[PDB]
Amino acid sequence: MLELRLVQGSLLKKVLEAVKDLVNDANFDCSTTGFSLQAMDSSHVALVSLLLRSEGFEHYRCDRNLSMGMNLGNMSKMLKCAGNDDIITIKADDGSDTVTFMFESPTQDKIADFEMKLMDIDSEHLGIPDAEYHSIVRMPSGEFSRICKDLSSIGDTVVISVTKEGVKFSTAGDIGTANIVLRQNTTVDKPEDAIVIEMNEPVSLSFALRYMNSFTKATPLSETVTISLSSELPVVVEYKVAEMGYIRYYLAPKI
Amino acid sequence: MLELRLVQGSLLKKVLEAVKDLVNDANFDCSTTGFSLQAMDSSHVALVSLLLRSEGFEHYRCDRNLSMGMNLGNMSKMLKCAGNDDIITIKADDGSDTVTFMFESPTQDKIADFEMKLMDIDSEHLGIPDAEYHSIVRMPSGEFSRICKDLSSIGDTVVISVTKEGVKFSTAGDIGTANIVLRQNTTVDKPEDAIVIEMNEPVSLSFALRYMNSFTKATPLSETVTISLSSELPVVVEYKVAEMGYIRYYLAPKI
Amino acid sequence: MLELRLVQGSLLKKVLEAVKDLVNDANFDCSTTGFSLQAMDSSHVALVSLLLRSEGFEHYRCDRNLSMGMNLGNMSKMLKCAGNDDIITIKADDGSDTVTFMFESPTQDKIADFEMKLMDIDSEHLGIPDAEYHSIVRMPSGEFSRICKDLSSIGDTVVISVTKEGVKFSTAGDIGTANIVLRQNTTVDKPEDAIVIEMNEPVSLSFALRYMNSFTKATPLSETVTISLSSELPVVVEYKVAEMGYIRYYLAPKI
Amino acid sequence: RQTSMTDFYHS
Amino acid sequence: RQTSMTDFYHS
Amino acid sequence: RQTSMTDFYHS
């Protein structure tokens, strides 16, 4: 039996709304550690790593390590039905091929029960070693979404280069060229100016904006997004989940 | 002559916005008692019943009983032009293929005159006995709208069952099953908790969600909705019009 | 060398959003006096005339009279990428077929460079004599926008007539007729809601609402719109830009 | 099976 | 019938 | 040319 009670149900809703546009089906792994997920898109160009640590759940019950294969869109359609104020509970009896989503109001005057069928999924899991990236860029999530959306209206590829002069985002297309340079302010005196740019060694890589724009679906999860880059590795775009975990997007470069 | 003056013009707009998606055209009946209407959709599966009492109008003048057949889409487009604060006046000459709508700003700086062509409608009125339903549910209108909206993303039919344990809304479809149970709280201490469930006898009927979702277009008319159920009758979903009348929707069950 | 720095970049954004739906491409003319544009739509029915006086720009550097042929849709796609608080600088080298748009944030933490190719445009600049209009109507832009939008849902042509009894906007179509009469109040409160009507001689002209609805795209530029009418001339619909210029729309009548 | 309003109420 | 801008103003 | 995640990490 599996019973995970999460007080802030809006998180799970925002988490599923994120991953669903990049991945159709994936396994949710439940362990003593927590609720996790790892999957690549159909092309194997991008990868998504999700973690909702056990500490975040007001109640975490997991007798044995298990995996639940799921149609992310379907689970998302179901979670869309819970009120942002609702207390969501994931229940699963290892002996059945169904998972149960309970949605309870704070007052308990409304209790919803959403049963869904699981599915056998044989997904490929990659071993991702930790590494100190050459350049780390922290900026307002809304601004990152802005840059990707804007630049994609101009071209399809974005060259993200980090030097001593800041981080440049450039693209070219049929109508012309466009680049956007962000630099740290004298001080971080407001959210907008919360741009931190760590740069141990200069980096410059090119990526498909279509994928970057898919990662931005996670925007509502946090006000900040962290971008990690190394000259010989896929970029990392991370959004913290509240304070109990995260969603990490990996995107192979164009070389 | 027929002349009705309604200070809160937004009400008439909301009423037409309600009735229009369920019924394309209907006769508006006028008497010394009020401005009323009764019509069934094309399938005869649903029926809408509207009543705007004479005392609700700042000025009510209706000599003889008269019927004005109107294309609800056309009337709604005209009412869409009036402002929410505008004073709406309905004028109709006895025996004329046109009805006049006057929109006046509170300061009178703006006066609009909309003349609409009437139409001939063979009304098919039904005699509905005023009964005491076995179960009656009163809840926030917005909550009823989400229940129907959320459930229809799962299935096409909803089983509404009322017992001593509360009122249950359930549906089932390809992606799985879902049910929402509402119960009265220890007290009604806020709108979200304004759930009143009267149960004289248990009931359980199945309905097409597509029609419920249409009835919910009347949501902005009131903060509350009343659902009356009985085993041998169509359900009645009611939205009170301000304080001067109502819109009642009747839906035939799937037996 | 052309370099025009405008602090409130939102003005340029609104100006382009306005003119682009009426004209696909046009010449922007730069002179010591200002940044202007004059063009007719493809049917020669409407003419748009814009002027951003040199004084409005924080930095106005223009060597000689130069014209820049611009695909309006493209320029707008690029300006859409600038933030509303951003400072926009237009750069162009006398001997170059490209134009540059710089978007700089107030704190300077972000600098964007947008480069567009210019095009060749043979413009037919009409000489519009200054005139004494028989009737002038100054009203809230939002009210003008709603009048045209509303009447166009009824018909294709609007008859705008000014007399001692105020200004009337009427249209007629298949569903019926509509006329909106506006009059000045005993007193005026604030121009953002005020209606002024100057009338030397009674006017009454017919126009295609399709064009009026296009002019209204300029609505966000001002809280007020001015309409000038003369029996023997096209109507002029004007929106002030800030306090540094304007957009004047001209519409040939239907006689 | 979907019933009709007329299966319950008449003119 | 719709007129033209060029019917009132010239280059 | 677009590379793949598998070009850097493995199962």
Side-chain angles (χ1 to χ4, degrees), chain C residues 166-198:
Chain C
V167 54
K168 177 157 63 179
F169 297 86
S170 42
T171 194
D174 309 349
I175 86 174
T177 68
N179 76 54
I180 302 175
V181 178
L182 293 185
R183 299 147 61 212
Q184 302 182 155
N185 280 319
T186 292
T187 66
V188 169
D189 200 304
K190 294 185 176 182
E192 297 192 9
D193 40 88
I195 168 192
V196 175
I197 297 170
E198 258 102 50

PDB file of all heavy atoms in Angstrom, chain C residues 166-198:
ATOM      1  N   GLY C 166     -26.863  66.784 -30.449  1.00  0.00           N
ATOM      2  CA  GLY C 166     -25.749  65.901 -30.140  1.00  0.00           C
ATOM      3  C   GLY C 166     -25.207  65.120 -31.321  1.00  0.00           C
ATOM      4  O   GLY C 166     -25.408  65.501 -32.467  1.00  0.00           O
ATOM      5  N   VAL C 167     -24.479  64.048 -31.040  1.00  0.00           N
ATOM      6  CA  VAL C 167     -23.942  63.204 -32.101  1.00  0.00           C
ATOM      7  C   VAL C 167     -24.590  61.814 -32.074  1.00  0.00           C
ATOM      8  O   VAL C 167     -24.710  61.183 -31.016  1.00  0.00           O
ATOM      9  CB  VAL C 167     -22.403  63.070 -32.031  1.00  0.00           C
ATOM     10  CG1 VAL C 167     -21.962  62.601 -30.655  1.00  0.00           C
ATOM     11  CG2 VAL C 167     -21.908  62.111 -33.117  1.00  0.00           C
ATOM     12  N   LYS C 168     -25.058  61.372 -33.238  1.00  0.00           N
ATOM     13  CA  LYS C 168     -25.676  60.062 -33.360  1.00  0.00           C
ATOM     14  C   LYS C 168     -24.889  59.119 -34.274  1.00  0.00           C
ATOM     15  O   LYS C 168     -24.358  59.522 -35.311  1.00  0.00           O
ATOM     16  CB  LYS C 168     -27.127  60.185 -33.834  1.00  0.00           C
ATOM     17  CG  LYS C 168     -27.815  58.832 -34.052  1.00  0.00           C
ATOM     18  CD  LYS C 168     -29.327  58.927 -33.976  1.00  0.00           C
ATOM     19  CE  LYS C 168     -29.924  59.799 -35.059  1.00  0.00           C
ATOM     20  NZ  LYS C 168     -31.416  59.806 -34.915  1.00  0.00           N
ATOM     21  N   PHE C 169     -24.755  57.877 -33.825  1.00  0.00           N
ATOM     22  CA  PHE C 169     -24.065  56.832 -34.573  1.00  0.00           C
ATOM     23  C   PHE C 169     -25.132  55.775 -34.842  1.00  0.00           C
ATOM     24  O   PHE C 169     -25.675  55.180 -33.910  1.00  0.00           O
ATOM     25  CB  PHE C 169     -22.943  56.198 -33.738  1.00  0.00           C
ATOM     26  CG  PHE C 169     -21.834  57.145 -33.364  1.00  0.00           C
ATOM     27  CD1 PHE C 169     -21.931  57.940 -32.222  1.00  0.00           C
ATOM     28  CD2 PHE C 169     -20.678  57.219 -34.133  1.00  0.00           C
ATOM     29  CE1 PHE C 169     -20.897  58.790 -31.854  1.00  0.00           C
ATOM     30  CE2 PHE C 169     -19.634  58.072 -33.768  1.00  0.00           C
ATOM     31  CZ  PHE C 169     -19.746  58.858 -32.625  1.00  0.00           C
ATOM     32  N   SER C 170     -25.466  55.564 -36.105  1.00  0.00           N
ATOM     33  CA  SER C 170     -26.470  54.573 -36.430  1.00  0.00           C
ATOM     34  C   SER C 170     -26.012  53.604 -37.491  1.00  0.00           C
ATOM     35  O   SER C 170     -25.162  53.922 -38.320  1.00  0.00           O
ATOM     36  CB  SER C 170     -27.783  55.241 -36.846  1.00  0.00           C
ATOM     37  OG  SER C 170     -27.537  56.343 -37.683  1.00  0.00           O
ATOM     38  N   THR C 171     -26.564  52.399 -37.428  1.00  0.00           N
ATOM     39  CA  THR C 171     -26.246  51.352 -38.378  1.00  0.00           C
ATOM     40  C   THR C 171     -27.508  50.519 -38.540  1.00  0.00           C
ATOM     41  O   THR C 171     -28.451  50.659 -37.761  1.00  0.00           O
ATOM     42  CB  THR C 171     -25.079  50.492 -37.863  1.00  0.00           C
ATOM     43  OG1 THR C 171     -24.571  49.680 -38.924  1.00  0.00           O
ATOM     44  CG2 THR C 171     -25.537  49.599 -36.727  1.00  0.00           C
ATOM     45  N   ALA C 172     -27.551  49.683 -39.565  1.00  0.00           N
ATOM     46  CA  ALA C 172     -28.719  48.843 -39.804  1.00  0.00           C
ATOM     47  C   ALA C 172     -28.258  47.574 -40.461  1.00  0.00           C
ATOM     48  O   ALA C 172     -27.353  47.596 -41.294  1.00  0.00           O
ATOM     49  CB  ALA C 172     -29.734  49.561 -40.698  1.00  0.00           C
ATOM     50  N   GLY C 173     -28.889  46.467 -40.087  1.00  0.00           N
ATOM     51  CA  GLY C 173     -28.519  45.181 -40.646  1.00  0.00           C
ATOM     52  C   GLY C 173     -29.679  44.218 -40.633  1.00  0.00           C
ATOM     53  O   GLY C 173     -30.801  44.595 -40.303  1.00  0.00           O
ATOM     54  N   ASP C 174     -29.391  42.955 -40.931  1.00  0.00           N
ATOM     55  CA  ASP C 174     -30.415  41.917 -40.991  1.00  0.00           C
ATOM     56  C   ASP C 174     -31.175  41.691 -39.684  1.00  0.00           C
ATOM     57  O   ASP C 174     -32.399  41.536 -39.695  1.00  0.00           O
ATOM     58  CB  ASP C 174     -29.801  40.601 -41.492  1.00  0.00           C
ATOM     59  CG  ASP C 174     -29.005  40.773 -42.797  1.00  0.00           C
ATOM     60  OD1 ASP C 174     -29.088  41.851 -43.436  1.00  0.00           O
ATOM     61  OD2 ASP C 174     -28.282  39.826 -43.181  1.00  0.00           O
ATOM     62  N   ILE C 175     -30.472  41.715 -38.554  1.00  0.00           N
ATOM     63  CA  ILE C 175     -31.139  41.486 -37.275  1.00  0.00           C
ATOM     64  C   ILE C 175     -31.951  42.678 -36.760  1.00  0.00           C
ATOM     65  O   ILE C 175     -32.827  42.516 -35.909  1.00  0.00           O
ATOM     66  CB  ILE C 175     -30.159  40.950 -36.178  1.00  0.00           C
ATOM     67  CG1 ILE C 175     -29.443  42.081 -35.447  1.00  0.00           C
ATOM     68  CG2 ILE C 175     -29.107  40.024 -36.803  1.00  0.00           C
ATOM     69  CD1 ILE C 175     -28.607  41.571 -34.281  1.00  0.00           C
ATOM     70  N   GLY C 176     -31.706  43.857 -37.329  1.00  0.00           N
ATOM     71  CA  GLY C 176     -32.421  45.052 -36.910  1.00  0.00           C
ATOM     72  C   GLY C 176     -31.581  46.311 -37.077  1.00  0.00           C
ATOM     73  O   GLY C 176     -30.608  46.315 -37.840  1.00  0.00           O
ATOM     74  N   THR C 177     -31.952  47.376 -36.365  1.00  0.00           N
ATOM     75  CA  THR C 177     -31.228  48.652 -36.445  1.00  0.00           C
ATOM     76  C   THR C 177     -30.740  49.119 -35.073  1.00  0.00           C
ATOM     77  O   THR C 177     -31.252  48.701 -34.035  1.00  0.00           O
ATOM     78  CB  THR C 177     -32.109  49.794 -37.027  1.00  0.00           C
ATOM     79  OG1 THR C 177     -33.145  50.108 -36.098  1.00  0.00           O
ATOM     80  CG2 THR C 177     -32.744  49.389 -38.346  1.00  0.00           C
ATOM     81  N   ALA C 178     -29.783  50.037 -35.075  1.00  0.00           N
ATOM     82  CA  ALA C 178     -29.251  50.561 -33.833  1.00  0.00           C
ATOM     83  C   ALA C 178     -28.698  51.955 -34.019  1.00  0.00           C
ATOM     84  O   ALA C 178     -28.088  52.269 -35.046  1.00  0.00           O
ATOM     85  CB  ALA C 178     -28.156  49.646 -33.308  1.00  0.00           C
ATOM     86  N   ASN C 179     -28.931  52.804 -33.031  1.00  0.00           N
ATOM     87  CA  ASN C 179     -28.400  54.150 -33.067  1.00  0.00           C
ATOM     88  C   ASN C 179     -28.027  54.553 -31.653  1.00  0.00           C
ATOM     89  O   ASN C 179     -28.736  54.233 -30.698  1.00  0.00           O
ATOM     90  CB  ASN C 179     -29.368  55.148 -33.735  1.00  0.00           C
ATOM     91  CG  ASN C 179     -30.530  55.536 -32.855  1.00  0.00           C
ATOM     92  OD1 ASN C 179     -30.347  55.977 -31.718  1.00  0.00           O
ATOM     93  ND2 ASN C 179     -31.738  55.425 -33.394  1.00  0.00           N
ATOM     94  N   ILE C 180     -26.862  55.174 -31.523  1.00  0.00           N
ATOM     95  CA  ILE C 180     -26.363  55.614 -30.233  1.00  0.00           C
ATOM     96  C   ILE C 180     -26.170  57.125 -30.260  1.00  0.00           C
ATOM     97  O   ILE C 180     -25.355  57.638 -31.027  1.00  0.00           O
ATOM     98  CB  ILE C 180     -25.041  54.890 -29.890  1.00  0.00           C
ATOM     99  CG1 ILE C 180     -25.279  53.373 -29.885  1.00  0.00           C
ATOM    100  CG2 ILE C 180     -24.512  55.358 -28.539  1.00  0.00           C
ATOM    101  CD1 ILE C 180     -24.035  52.525 -29.677  1.00  0.00           C
ATOM    102  N   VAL C 181     -26.966  57.826 -29.453  1.00  0.00           N
ATOM    103  CA  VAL C 181     -26.923  59.284 -29.355  1.00  0.00           C
ATOM    104  C   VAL C 181     -26.151  59.743 -28.125  1.00  0.00           C
ATOM    105  O   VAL C 181     -26.456  59.338 -26.994  1.00  0.00           O
ATOM    106  CB  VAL C 181     -28.350  59.889 -29.285  1.00  0.00           C
ATOM    107  CG1 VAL C 181     -28.281  61.397 -29.125  1.00  0.00           C
ATOM    108  CG2 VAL C 181     -29.136  59.543 -30.538  1.00  0.00           C
ATOM    109  N   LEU C 182     -25.149  60.587 -28.350  1.00  0.00           N
ATOM    110  CA  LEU C 182     -24.335  61.125 -27.263  1.00  0.00           C
ATOM    111  C   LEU C 182     -24.561  62.624 -27.152  1.00  0.00           C
ATOM    112  O   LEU C 182     -24.608  63.328 -28.162  1.00  0.00           O
ATOM    113  CB  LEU C 182     -22.854  60.860 -27.510  1.00  0.00           C
ATOM    114  CG  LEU C 182     -22.337  59.433 -27.483  1.00  0.00           C
ATOM    115  CD1 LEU C 182     -20.840  59.466 -27.633  1.00  0.00           C
ATOM    116  CD2 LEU C 182     -22.697  58.791 -26.176  1.00  0.00           C
ATOM    117  N   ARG C 183     -24.653  63.113 -25.920  1.00  0.00           N
ATOM    118  CA  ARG C 183     -24.881  64.536 -25.670  1.00  0.00           C
ATOM    119  C   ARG C 183     -24.024  64.984 -24.493  1.00  0.00           C
ATOM    120  O   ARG C 183     -23.678  64.176 -23.634  1.00  0.00           O
ATOM    121  CB  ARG C 183     -26.363  64.771 -25.338  1.00  0.00           C
ATOM    122  CG  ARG C 183     -27.331  64.388 -26.453  1.00  0.00           C
ATOM    123  CD  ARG C 183     -28.655  63.858 -25.915  1.00  0.00           C
ATOM    124  NE  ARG C 183     -29.359  64.846 -25.101  1.00  0.00           N
ATOM    125  CZ  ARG C 183     -30.140  64.551 -24.062  1.00  0.00           C
ATOM    126  NH1 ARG C 183     -30.329  63.283 -23.697  1.00  0.00           N
ATOM    127  NH2 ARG C 183     -30.712  65.529 -23.368  1.00  0.00           N
ATOM    128  N   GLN C 184     -23.667  66.263 -24.452  1.00  0.00           N
ATOM    129  CA  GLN C 184     -22.872  66.779 -23.340  1.00  0.00           C
ATOM    130  C   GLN C 184     -23.777  66.902 -22.119  1.00  0.00           C
ATOM    131  O   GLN C 184     -24.978  67.119 -22.264  1.00  0.00           O
ATOM    132  CB  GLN C 184     -22.328  68.175 -23.655  1.00  0.00           C
ATOM    133  CG  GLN C 184     -21.460  68.295 -24.892  1.00  0.00           C
ATOM    134  CD  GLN C 184     -20.933  69.712 -25.075  1.00  0.00           C
ATOM    135  OE1 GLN C 184     -19.899  69.925 -25.699  1.00  0.00           O
ATOM    136  NE2 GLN C 184     -21.651  70.690 -24.525  1.00  0.00           N
ATOM    137  N   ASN C 185     -23.212  66.731 -20.926  1.00  0.00           N
ATOM    138  CA  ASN C 185     -23.975  66.884 -19.684  1.00  0.00           C
ATOM    139  C   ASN C 185     -23.926  68.360 -19.276  1.00  0.00           C
ATOM    140  O   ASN C 185     -23.231  69.165 -19.900  1.00  0.00           O
ATOM    141  CB  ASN C 185     -23.362  66.051 -18.549  1.00  0.00           C
ATOM    142  CG  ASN C 185     -23.754  64.591 -18.611  1.00  0.00           C
ATOM    143  OD1 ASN C 185     -24.906  64.256 -18.887  1.00  0.00           O
ATOM    144  ND2 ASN C 185     -22.797  63.709 -18.334  1.00  0.00           N
ATOM    145  N   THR C 186     -24.642  68.703 -18.213  1.00  0.00           N
ATOM    146  CA  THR C 186     -24.652  70.075 -17.719  1.00  0.00           C
ATOM    147  C   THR C 186     -23.220  70.456 -17.335  1.00  0.00           C
ATOM    148  O   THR C 186     -22.781  71.590 -17.566  1.00  0.00           O
ATOM    149  CB  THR C 186     -25.607  70.228 -16.503  1.00  0.00           C
ATOM    150  OG1 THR C 186     -26.956  70.045 -16.936  1.00  0.00           O
ATOM    151  CG2 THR C 186     -25.485  71.602 -15.888  1.00  0.00           C
ATOM    152  N   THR C 187     -22.496  69.485 -16.779  1.00  0.00           N
ATOM    153  CA  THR C 187     -21.104  69.671 -16.381  1.00  0.00           C
ATOM    154  C   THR C 187     -20.284  68.470 -16.828  1.00  0.00           C
ATOM    155  O   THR C 187     -20.821  67.403 -17.129  1.00  0.00           O
ATOM    156  CB  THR C 187     -20.927  69.820 -14.845  1.00  0.00           C
ATOM    157  OG1 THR C 187     -21.271  68.594 -14.195  1.00  0.00           O
ATOM    158  CG2 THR C 187     -21.802  70.927 -14.303  1.00  0.00           C
ATOM    159  N   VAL C 188     -18.977  68.665 -16.878  1.00  0.00           N
ATOM    160  CA  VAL C 188     -18.032  67.629 -17.262  1.00  0.00           C
ATOM    161  C   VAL C 188     -17.249  67.296 -15.999  1.00  0.00           C
ATOM    162  O   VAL C 188     -16.994  68.173 -15.182  1.00  0.00           O
ATOM    163  CB  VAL C 188     -17.038  68.165 -18.322  1.00  0.00           C
ATOM    164  CG1 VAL C 188     -15.889  67.196 -18.522  1.00  0.00           C
ATOM    165  CG2 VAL C 188     -17.746  68.420 -19.631  1.00  0.00           C
ATOM    166  N   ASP C 189     -16.907  66.028 -15.812  1.00  0.00           N
ATOM    167  CA  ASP C 189     -16.128  65.641 -14.643  1.00  0.00           C
ATOM    168  C   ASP C 189     -14.660  65.581 -15.076  1.00  0.00           C
ATOM    169  O   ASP C 189     -13.893  66.520 -14.838  1.00  0.00           O
ATOM    170  CB  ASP C 189     -16.592  64.285 -14.104  1.00  0.00           C
ATOM    171  CG  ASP C 189     -16.179  64.060 -12.657  1.00  0.00           C
ATOM    172  OD1 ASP C 189     -14.966  64.139 -12.341  1.00  0.00           O
ATOM    173  OD2 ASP C 189     -17.081  63.809 -11.830  1.00  0.00           O
ATOM    174  N   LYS C 190     -14.293  64.494 -15.750  1.00  0.00           N
ATOM    175  CA  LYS C 190     -12.931  64.293 -16.236  1.00  0.00           C
ATOM    176  C   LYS C 190     -12.958  63.800 -17.680  1.00  0.00           C
ATOM    177  O   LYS C 190     -13.757  62.934 -18.029  1.00  0.00           O
ATOM    178  CB  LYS C 190     -12.194  63.283 -15.352  1.00  0.00           C
ATOM    179  CG  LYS C 190     -11.966  63.765 -13.926  1.00  0.00           C
ATOM    180  CD  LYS C 190     -11.136  62.771 -13.133  1.00  0.00           C
ATOM    181  CE  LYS C 190     -10.821  63.306 -11.741  1.00  0.00           C
ATOM    182  NZ  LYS C 190      -9.973  62.349 -10.969  1.00  0.00           N
ATOM    183  N   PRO C 191     -12.099  64.370 -18.546  1.00  0.00           N
ATOM    184  CA  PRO C 191     -11.986  64.023 -19.971  1.00  0.00           C
ATOM    185  C   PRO C 191     -11.932  62.522 -20.289  1.00  0.00           C
ATOM    186  O   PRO C 191     -12.370  62.092 -21.361  1.00  0.00           O
ATOM    187  CB  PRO C 191     -10.715  64.755 -20.387  1.00  0.00           C
ATOM    188  CG  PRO C 191     -10.829  66.028 -19.588  1.00  0.00           C
ATOM    189  CD  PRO C 191     -11.214  65.502 -18.216  1.00  0.00           C
ATOM    190  N   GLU C 192     -11.410  61.731 -19.353  1.00  0.00           N
ATOM    191  CA  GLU C 192     -11.330  60.278 -19.514  1.00  0.00           C
ATOM    192  C   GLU C 192     -12.739  59.660 -19.569  1.00  0.00           C
ATOM    193  O   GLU C 192     -12.901  58.469 -19.866  1.00  0.00           O
ATOM    194  CB  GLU C 192     -10.548  59.651 -18.350  1.00  0.00           C
ATOM    195  CG  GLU C 192      -9.079  60.081 -18.243  1.00  0.00           C
ATOM    196  CD  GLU C 192      -8.275  59.222 -17.262  1.00  0.00           C
ATOM    197  OE1 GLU C 192      -8.797  58.181 -16.792  1.00  0.00           O
ATOM    198  OE2 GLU C 192      -7.109  59.586 -16.971  1.00  0.00           O
ATOM    199  N   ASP C 193     -13.744  60.478 -19.249  1.00  0.00           N
ATOM    200  CA  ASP C 193     -15.150  60.078 -19.257  1.00  0.00           C
ATOM    201  C   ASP C 193     -16.037  61.192 -19.828  1.00  0.00           C
ATOM    202  O   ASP C 193     -17.257  61.036 -19.932  1.00  0.00           O
ATOM    203  CB  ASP C 193     -15.607  59.697 -17.841  1.00  0.00           C
ATOM    204  CG  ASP C 193     -15.035  60.618 -16.765  1.00  0.00           C
ATOM    205  OD1 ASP C 193     -15.662  61.665 -16.472  1.00  0.00           O
ATOM    206  OD2 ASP C 193     -13.958  60.290 -16.210  1.00  0.00           O
ATOM    207  N   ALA C 194     -15.399  62.281 -20.255  1.00  0.00           N
ATOM    208  CA  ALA C 194     -16.078  63.448 -20.809  1.00  0.00           C
ATOM    209  C   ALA C 194     -16.422  63.369 -22.291  1.00  0.00           C
ATOM    210  O   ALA C 194     -15.711  62.752 -23.084  1.00  0.00           O
ATOM    211  CB  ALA C 194     -15.240  64.667 -20.569  1.00  0.00           C
ATOM    212  N   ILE C 195     -17.482  64.067 -22.671  1.00  0.00           N
ATOM    213  CA  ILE C 195     -17.911  64.107 -24.061  1.00  0.00           C
ATOM    214  C   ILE C 195     -18.082  65.550 -24.499  1.00  0.00           C
ATOM    215  O   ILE C 195     -18.952  66.255 -23.998  1.00  0.00           O
ATOM    216  CB  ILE C 195     -19.245  63.367 -24.270  1.00  0.00           C
ATOM    217  CG1 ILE C 195     -19.794  63.697 -25.657  1.00  0.00           C
ATOM    218  CG2 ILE C 195     -20.243  63.737 -23.170  1.00  0.00           C
ATOM    219  CD1 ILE C 195     -21.203  63.281 -25.869  1.00  0.00           C
ATOM    220  N   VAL C 196     -17.235  65.999 -25.416  1.00  0.00           N
ATOM    221  CA  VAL C 196     -17.320  67.364 -25.916  1.00  0.00           C
ATOM    222  C   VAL C 196     -17.747  67.294 -27.370  1.00  0.00           C
ATOM    223  O   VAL C 196     -17.247  66.457 -28.115  1.00  0.00           O
ATOM    224  CB  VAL C 196     -15.964  68.100 -25.791  1.00  0.00           C
ATOM    225  CG1 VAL C 196     -16.038  69.473 -26.417  1.00  0.00           C
ATOM    226  CG2 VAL C 196     -15.566  68.211 -24.339  1.00  0.00           C
ATOM    227  N   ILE C 197     -18.663  68.174 -27.771  1.00  0.00           N
ATOM    228  CA  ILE C 197     -19.177  68.203 -29.140  1.00  0.00           C
ATOM    229  C   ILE C 197     -19.259  69.609 -29.740  1.00  0.00           C
ATOM    230  O   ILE C 197     -20.181  70.358 -29.434  1.00  0.00           O
ATOM    231  CB  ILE C 197     -20.593  67.565 -29.211  1.00  0.00           C
ATOM    232  CG1 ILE C 197     -20.538  66.091 -28.819  1.00  0.00           C
ATOM    233  CG2 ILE C 197     -21.174  67.691 -30.614  1.00  0.00           C
ATOM    234  CD1 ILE C 197     -21.897  65.469 -28.625  1.00  0.00           C
ATOM    235  N   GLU C 198     -18.293  69.964 -30.585  1.00  0.00           N
ATOM    236  CA  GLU C 198     -18.288  71.263 -31.256  1.00  0.00           C
ATOM    237  C   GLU C 198     -19.104  71.095 -32.537  1.00  0.00           C
ATOM    238  O   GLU C 198     -18.961  70.081 -33.222  1.00  0.00           O
ATOM    239  CB  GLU C 198     -16.860  71.702 -31.609  1.00  0.00           C
ATOM    240  CG  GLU C 198     -16.243  72.748 -30.665  1.00  0.00           C
ATOM    241  CD  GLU C 198     -15.239  72.165 -29.655  1.00  0.00           C
ATOM    242  OE1 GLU C 198     -14.318  71.417 -30.073  1.00  0.00           O
ATOM    243  OE2 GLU C 198     -15.356  72.477 -28.445  1.00  0.00           O
TER     244      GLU C 198
END
